[PDB]
Amino acid sequence: KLGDICFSLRYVPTAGKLTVVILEAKNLKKMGVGGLSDPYVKIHLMQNGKRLKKKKTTIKKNTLNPYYNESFSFEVPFEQIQKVQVVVTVLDYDKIGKNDAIGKVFVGYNSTGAELRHWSDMLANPRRPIAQWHTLQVEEEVDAMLAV
């Protein structure tokens, strides 16, 4: 209905290196009245309702099923990795106007369901990259869970 996003997570406790690889999205909802779907993905590191770091992928043109294979890394010490969130948002890009979020998901502290499972798998397996699909959710709901 909104679409799905596949990404991998890897955590290296000694270095405090958290790596997120945005692999692909599928079944994306088309936004706006007309035009084309030009999706990109934002990755935010959060704690206590604050965005600590922001990263984003390149923009793919005219697709509801983009592939990215783009890697991003964050510095999160092992004493703090259980208390952060990684937020993944898919948006429709236009050079004019605020880009509409298609949907988003977060993993980490306070996550649930398949999102918590993905994070728990990462923590249980240091240095192992773990890829999983996630269902995108409306930003209204995800943002309410992330706010303080």
JSON list of C-alpha atoms in Angstrom, two decimals:
[
{"chain": "A", "resi": 1, "resn": "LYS", "atom": "CA", "xyz": [0.00, 0.00, 0.00]},
{"chain": "A", "resi": 2, "resn": "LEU", "atom": "CA", "xyz": [2.78, 2.55, 0.77]},
{"chain": "A", "resi": 3, "resn": "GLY", "atom": "CA", "xyz": [5.60, 0.24, -0.31]},
{"chain": "A", "resi": 4, "resn": "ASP", "atom": "CA", "xyz": [8.48, -1.67, 1.19]},
{"chain": "A", "resi": 5, "resn": "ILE", "atom": "CA", "xyz": [12.17, -0.96, 1.74]},
{"chain": "A", "resi": 6, "resn": "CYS", "atom": "CA", "xyz": [15.07, -3.42, 1.97]},
{"chain": "A", "resi": 7, "resn": "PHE", "atom": "CA", "xyz": [18.19, -2.42, 3.85]},
{"chain": "A", "resi": 8, "resn": "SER", "atom": "CA", "xyz": [21.02, -4.07, 5.71]},
{"chain": "A", "resi": 9, "resn": "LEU", "atom": "CA", "xyz": [22.35, -3.34, 9.17]},
{"chain": "A", "resi": 10, "resn": "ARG", "atom": "CA", "xyz": [25.80, -4.10, 10.56]},
{"chain": "A", "resi": 11, "resn": "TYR", "atom": "CA", "xyz": [27.27, -3.11, 13.90]},
{"chain": "A", "resi": 12, "resn": "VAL", "atom": "CA", "xyz": [30.91, -3.39, 14.95]},
{"chain": "A", "resi": 13, "resn": "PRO", "atom": "CA", "xyz": [31.08, -2.86, 18.74]},
{"chain": "A", "resi": 14, "resn": "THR", "atom": "CA", "xyz": [34.84, -2.31, 19.15]},
{"chain": "A", "resi": 15, "resn": "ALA", "atom": "CA", "xyz": [34.95, 0.46, 16.52]},
{"chain": "A", "resi": 16, "resn": "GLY", "atom": "CA", "xyz": [31.43, 1.66, 17.27]},
{"chain": "A", "resi": 17, "resn": "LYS", "atom": "CA", "xyz": [30.61, 1.51, 13.56]},
{"chain": "A", "resi": 18, "resn": "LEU", "atom": "CA", "xyz": [26.96, 1.23, 12.48]},
{"chain": "A", "resi": 19, "resn": "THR", "atom": "CA", "xyz": [26.50, 0.61, 8.73]},
{"chain": "A", "resi": 20, "resn": "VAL", "atom": "CA", "xyz": [23.20, 0.89, 6.88]},
{"chain": "A", "resi": 21, "resn": "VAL", "atom": "CA", "xyz": [23.03, -0.19, 3.22]},
{"chain": "A", "resi": 22, "resn": "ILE", "atom": "CA", "xyz": [19.92, 0.97, 1.36]},
{"chain": "A", "resi": 23, "resn": "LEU", "atom": "CA", "xyz": [19.35, -1.86, -1.12]},
{"chain": "A", "resi": 24, "resn": "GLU", "atom": "CA", "xyz": [16.00, -1.31, -2.86]},
{"chain": "A", "resi": 25, "resn": "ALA", "atom": "CA", "xyz": [12.39, -0.27, -2.44]},
{"chain": "A", "resi": 26, "resn": "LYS", "atom": "CA", "xyz": [9.32, -1.80, -4.08]},
{"chain": "A", "resi": 27, "resn": "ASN", "atom": "CA", "xyz": [5.62, -1.24, -4.57]},
{"chain": "A", "resi": 28, "resn": "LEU", "atom": "CA", "xyz": [5.96, 2.46, -3.79]},
{"chain": "A", "resi": 29, "resn": "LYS", "atom": "CA", "xyz": [2.83, 4.59, -3.69]},
{"chain": "A", "resi": 30, "resn": "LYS", "atom": "CA", "xyz": [2.65, 7.35, -6.30]},
{"chain": "A", "resi": 31, "resn": "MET", "atom": "CA", "xyz": [2.33, 10.82, -4.79]},
{"chain": "A", "resi": 32, "resn": "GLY", "atom": "CA", "xyz": [0.92, 14.06, -6.11]},
{"chain": "A", "resi": 33, "resn": "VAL", "atom": "CA", "xyz": [-1.70, 14.32, -8.82]},
{"chain": "A", "resi": 34, "resn": "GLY", "atom": "CA", "xyz": [0.46, 13.70, -11.89]},
{"chain": "A", "resi": 35, "resn": "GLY", "atom": "CA", "xyz": [4.11, 13.65, -12.82]},
{"chain": "A", "resi": 36, "resn": "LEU", "atom": "CA", "xyz": [6.54, 10.83, -12.14]},
{"chain": "A", "resi": 37, "resn": "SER", "atom": "CA", "xyz": [7.86, 8.97, -9.12]},
{"chain": "A", "resi": 38, "resn": "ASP", "atom": "CA", "xyz": [11.48, 10.02, -8.44]},
{"chain": "A", "resi": 39, "resn": "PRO", "atom": "CA", "xyz": [12.32, 8.31, -5.14]},
{"chain": "A", "resi": 40, "resn": "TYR", "atom": "CA", "xyz": [15.24, 8.81, -2.80]},
{"chain": "A", "resi": 41, "resn": "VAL", "atom": "CA", "xyz": [15.86, 7.58, 0.72]},
{"chain": "A", "resi": 42, "resn": "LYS", "atom": "CA", "xyz": [16.82, 9.51, 3.86]},
{"chain": "A", "resi": 43, "resn": "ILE", "atom": "CA", "xyz": [18.57, 7.88, 6.79]},
{"chain": "A", "resi": 44, "resn": "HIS", "atom": "CA", "xyz": [18.50, 9.66, 10.13]},
{"chain": "A", "resi": 45, "resn": "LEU", "atom": "CA", "xyz": [20.26, 8.68, 13.33]},
{"chain": "A", "resi": 46, "resn": "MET", "atom": "CA", "xyz": [18.13, 9.75, 16.29]},
{"chain": "A", "resi": 47, "resn": "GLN", "atom": "CA", "xyz": [18.18, 9.75, 20.05]},
{"chain": "A", "resi": 48, "resn": "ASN", "atom": "CA", "xyz": [15.65, 11.25, 22.47]},
{"chain": "A", "resi": 49, "resn": "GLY", "atom": "CA", "xyz": [13.63, 12.74, 19.62]},
{"chain": "A", "resi": 50, "resn": "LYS", "atom": "CA", "xyz": [16.58, 14.60, 18.13]},
{"chain": "A", "resi": 51, "resn": "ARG", "atom": "CA", "xyz": [18.04, 13.99, 14.69]},
{"chain": "A", "resi": 52, "resn": "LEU", "atom": "CA", "xyz": [21.76, 13.50, 15.34]},
{"chain": "A", "resi": 53, "resn": "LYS", "atom": "CA", "xyz": [22.92, 12.74, 11.79]},
{"chain": "A", "resi": 54, "resn": "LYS", "atom": "CA", "xyz": [21.29, 12.89, 8.36]},
{"chain": "A", "resi": 55, "resn": "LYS", "atom": "CA", "xyz": [22.24, 11.03, 5.19]},
{"chain": "A", "resi": 56, "resn": "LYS", "atom": "CA", "xyz": [20.48, 10.47, 1.89]},
{"chain": "A", "resi": 57, "resn": "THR", "atom": "CA", "xyz": [20.76, 8.38, -1.25]},
{"chain": "A", "resi": 58, "resn": "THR", "atom": "CA", "xyz": [20.86, 9.48, -4.85]},
{"chain": "A", "resi": 59, "resn": "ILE", "atom": "CA", "xyz": [17.56, 10.08, -6.62]},
{"chain": "A", "resi": 60, "resn": "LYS", "atom": "CA", "xyz": [16.15, 7.49, -9.03]},
{"chain": "A", "resi": 61, "resn": "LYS", "atom": "CA", "xyz": [13.93, 8.69, -11.86]},
{"chain": "A", "resi": 62, "resn": "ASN", "atom": "CA", "xyz": [10.51, 7.40, -12.92]},
{"chain": "A", "resi": 63, "resn": "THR", "atom": "CA", "xyz": [10.26, 4.25, -10.83]},
{"chain": "A", "resi": 64, "resn": "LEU", "atom": "CA", "xyz": [8.17, 2.69, -8.09]},
{"chain": "A", "resi": 65, "resn": "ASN", "atom": "CA", "xyz": [10.82, -0.03, -7.60]},
{"chain": "A", "resi": 66, "resn": "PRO", "atom": "CA", "xyz": [14.19, 1.72, -7.23]},
{"chain": "A", "resi": 67, "resn": "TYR", "atom": "CA", "xyz": [17.48, -0.02, -6.58]},
{"chain": "A", "resi": 68, "resn": "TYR", "atom": "CA", "xyz": [20.18, 1.94, -4.73]},
{"chain": "A", "resi": 69, "resn": "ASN", "atom": "CA", "xyz": [22.86, -0.28, -3.14]},
{"chain": "A", "resi": 70, "resn": "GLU", "atom": "CA", "xyz": [24.23, 2.74, -1.28]},
{"chain": "A", "resi": 71, "resn": "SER", "atom": "CA", "xyz": [26.09, 2.38, 2.02]},
{"chain": "A", "resi": 72, "resn": "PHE", "atom": "CA", "xyz": [26.18, 4.80, 4.94]},
{"chain": "A", "resi": 73, "resn": "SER", "atom": "CA", "xyz": [27.99, 4.59, 8.24]},
{"chain": "A", "resi": 74, "resn": "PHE", "atom": "CA", "xyz": [27.48, 6.16, 11.63]},
{"chain": "A", "resi": 75, "resn": "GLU", "atom": "CA", "xyz": [29.68, 6.35, 14.73]},
{"chain": "A", "resi": 76, "resn": "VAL", "atom": "CA", "xyz": [27.75, 4.94, 17.70]},
{"chain": "A", "resi": 77, "resn": "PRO", "atom": "CA", "xyz": [29.74, 3.69, 20.71]},
{"chain": "A", "resi": 78, "resn": "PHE", "atom": "CA", "xyz": [28.75, 0.35, 22.18]},
{"chain": "A", "resi": 79, "resn": "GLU", "atom": "CA", "xyz": [27.47, 1.98, 25.39]},
{"chain": "A", "resi": 80, "resn": "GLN", "atom": "CA", "xyz": [24.94, 3.90, 23.27]},
{"chain": "A", "resi": 81, "resn": "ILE", "atom": "CA", "xyz": [23.92, 1.54, 20.47]},
{"chain": "A", "resi": 82, "resn": "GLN", "atom": "CA", "xyz": [20.95, 0.18, 22.40]},
{"chain": "A", "resi": 83, "resn": "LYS", "atom": "CA", "xyz": [19.55, 3.71, 22.86]},
{"chain": "A", "resi": 84, "resn": "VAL", "atom": "CA", "xyz": [19.54, 5.07, 19.28]},
{"chain": "A", "resi": 85, "resn": "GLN", "atom": "CA", "xyz": [17.11, 4.87, 16.38]},
{"chain": "A", "resi": 86, "resn": "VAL", "atom": "CA", "xyz": [17.87, 4.58, 12.69]},
{"chain": "A", "resi": 87, "resn": "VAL", "atom": "CA", "xyz": [15.03, 6.13, 10.68]},
{"chain": "A", "resi": 88, "resn": "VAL", "atom": "CA", "xyz": [14.59, 5.29, 6.99]},
{"chain": "A", "resi": 89, "resn": "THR", "atom": "CA", "xyz": [12.26, 7.45, 4.87]},
{"chain": "A", "resi": 90, "resn": "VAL", "atom": "CA", "xyz": [11.40, 7.12, 1.18]},
{"chain": "A", "resi": 91, "resn": "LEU", "atom": "CA", "xyz": [10.47, 10.41, -0.49]},
{"chain": "A", "resi": 92, "resn": "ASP", "atom": "CA", "xyz": [9.40, 11.59, -3.95]},
{"chain": "A", "resi": 93, "resn": "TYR", "atom": "CA", "xyz": [11.84, 14.21, -5.21]},
{"chain": "A", "resi": 94, "resn": "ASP", "atom": "CA", "xyz": [10.93, 17.38, -7.08]},
{"chain": "A", "resi": 95, "resn": "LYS", "atom": "CA", "xyz": [13.22, 20.34, -7.64]},
{"chain": "A", "resi": 96, "resn": "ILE", "atom": "CA", "xyz": [10.35, 22.62, -6.55]},
{"chain": "A", "resi": 97, "resn": "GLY", "atom": "CA", "xyz": [8.37, 22.20, -3.35]},
{"chain": "A", "resi": 98, "resn": "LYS", "atom": "CA", "xyz": [8.83, 20.16, -0.22]},
{"chain": "A", "resi": 99, "resn": "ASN", "atom": "CA", "xyz": [9.44, 16.54, -1.14]},
{"chain": "A", "resi": 100, "resn": "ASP", "atom": "CA", "xyz": [6.54, 14.33, -0.05]},
{"chain": "A", "resi": 101, "resn": "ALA", "atom": "CA", "xyz": [7.41, 11.38, 2.15]},
{"chain": "A", "resi": 102, "resn": "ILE", "atom": "CA", "xyz": [5.96, 8.16, 0.80]},
{"chain": "A", "resi": 103, "resn": "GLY", "atom": "CA", "xyz": [6.51, 6.40, 4.10]},
{"chain": "A", "resi": 104, "resn": "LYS", "atom": "CA", "xyz": [9.09, 5.53, 6.69]},
{"chain": "A", "resi": 105, "resn": "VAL", "atom": "CA", "xyz": [10.20, 3.01, 9.29]},
{"chain": "A", "resi": 106, "resn": "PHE", "atom": "CA", "xyz": [12.60, 3.02, 12.21]},
{"chain": "A", "resi": 107, "resn": "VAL", "atom": "CA", "xyz": [14.73, 0.37, 13.89]},
{"chain": "A", "resi": 108, "resn": "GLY", "atom": "CA", "xyz": [16.43, 0.46, 17.27]},
{"chain": "A", "resi": 109, "resn": "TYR", "atom": "CA", "xyz": [15.36, 1.71, 20.66]},
{"chain": "A", "resi": 110, "resn": "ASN", "atom": "CA", "xyz": [11.57, 1.59, 21.07]},
{"chain": "A", "resi": 111, "resn": "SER", "atom": "CA", "xyz": [11.10, -0.29, 17.78]},
{"chain": "A", "resi": 112, "resn": "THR", "atom": "CA", "xyz": [8.69, -3.21, 17.54]},
{"chain": "A", "resi": 113, "resn": "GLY", "atom": "CA", "xyz": [7.82, -6.19, 15.41]},
{"chain": "A", "resi": 114, "resn": "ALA", "atom": "CA", "xyz": [9.99, -6.85, 12.40]},
{"chain": "A", "resi": 115, "resn": "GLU", "atom": "CA", "xyz": [11.86, -3.61, 13.03]},
{"chain": "A", "resi": 116, "resn": "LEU", "atom": "CA", "xyz": [12.94, -4.68, 16.52]},
{"chain": "A", "resi": 117, "resn": "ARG", "atom": "CA", "xyz": [13.79, -8.15, 15.21]},
{"chain": "A", "resi": 118, "resn": "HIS", "atom": "CA", "xyz": [16.12, -6.71, 12.57]},
{"chain": "A", "resi": 119, "resn": "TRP", "atom": "CA", "xyz": [17.87, -4.55, 15.16]},
{"chain": "A", "resi": 120, "resn": "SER", "atom": "CA", "xyz": [18.12, -7.39, 17.66]},
{"chain": "A", "resi": 121, "resn": "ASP", "atom": "CA", "xyz": [19.64, -9.63, 14.97]},
{"chain": "A", "resi": 122, "resn": "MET", "atom": "CA", "xyz": [22.25, -6.95, 14.24]},
{"chain": "A", "resi": 123, "resn": "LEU", "atom": "CA", "xyz": [23.20, -6.63, 17.92]},
{"chain": "A", "resi": 124, "resn": "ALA", "atom": "CA", "xyz": [23.33, -10.37, 18.46]},
{"chain": "A", "resi": 125, "resn": "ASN", "atom": "CA", "xyz": [25.74, -10.83, 15.53]},
{"chain": "A", "resi": 126, "resn": "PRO", "atom": "CA", "xyz": [28.60, -8.31, 15.69]},
{"chain": "A", "resi": 127, "resn": "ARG", "atom": "CA", "xyz": [30.20, -7.60, 12.30]},
{"chain": "A", "resi": 128, "resn": "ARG", "atom": "CA", "xyz": [27.50, -9.58, 10.45]},
{"chain": "A", "resi": 129, "resn": "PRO", "atom": "CA", "xyz": [25.51, -7.62, 7.86]},
{"chain": "A", "resi": 130, "resn": "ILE", "atom": "CA", "xyz": [21.83, -8.51, 8.03]},
{"chain": "A", "resi": 131, "resn": "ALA", "atom": "CA", "xyz": [19.40, -7.61, 5.24]},
{"chain": "A", "resi": 132, "resn": "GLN", "atom": "CA", "xyz": [15.65, -7.40, 5.83]},
{"chain": "A", "resi": 133, "resn": "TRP", "atom": "CA", "xyz": [12.54, -6.04, 4.20]},
{"chain": "A", "resi": 134, "resn": "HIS", "atom": "CA", "xyz": [10.37, -3.56, 6.06]},
{"chain": "A", "resi": 135, "resn": "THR", "atom": "CA", "xyz": [6.87, -2.25, 5.36]},
{"chain": "A", "resi": 136, "resn": "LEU", "atom": "CA", "xyz": [6.75, 1.53, 5.02]},
{"chain": "A", "resi": 137, "resn": "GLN", "atom": "CA", "xyz": [4.44, 3.33, 7.44]},
{"chain": "A", "resi": 138, "resn": "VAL", "atom": "CA", "xyz": [2.78, 6.74, 7.32]},
{"chain": "A", "resi": 139, "resn": "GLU", "atom": "CA", "xyz": [5.07, 9.44, 8.69]},
{"chain": "A", "resi": 140, "resn": "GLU", "atom": "CA", "xyz": [2.40, 10.77, 11.06]},
{"chain": "A", "resi": 141, "resn": "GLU", "atom": "CA", "xyz": [2.55, 7.55, 13.06]},
{"chain": "A", "resi": 142, "resn": "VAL", "atom": "CA", "xyz": [6.28, 6.93, 12.94]},
{"chain": "A", "resi": 143, "resn": "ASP", "atom": "CA", "xyz": [7.04, 10.52, 13.88]},
{"chain": "A", "resi": 144, "resn": "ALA", "atom": "CA", "xyz": [4.73, 10.33, 16.89]},
{"chain": "A", "resi": 145, "resn": "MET", "atom": "CA", "xyz": [6.68, 7.31, 18.15]},
{"chain": "A", "resi": 146, "resn": "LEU", "atom": "CA", "xyz": [10.02, 9.07, 17.62]},
{"chain": "A", "resi": 147, "resn": "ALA", "atom": "CA", "xyz": [9.10, 12.38, 19.26]},
{"chain": "A", "resi": 148, "resn": "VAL", "atom": "CA", "xyz": [9.70, 13.25, 22.91]}
]
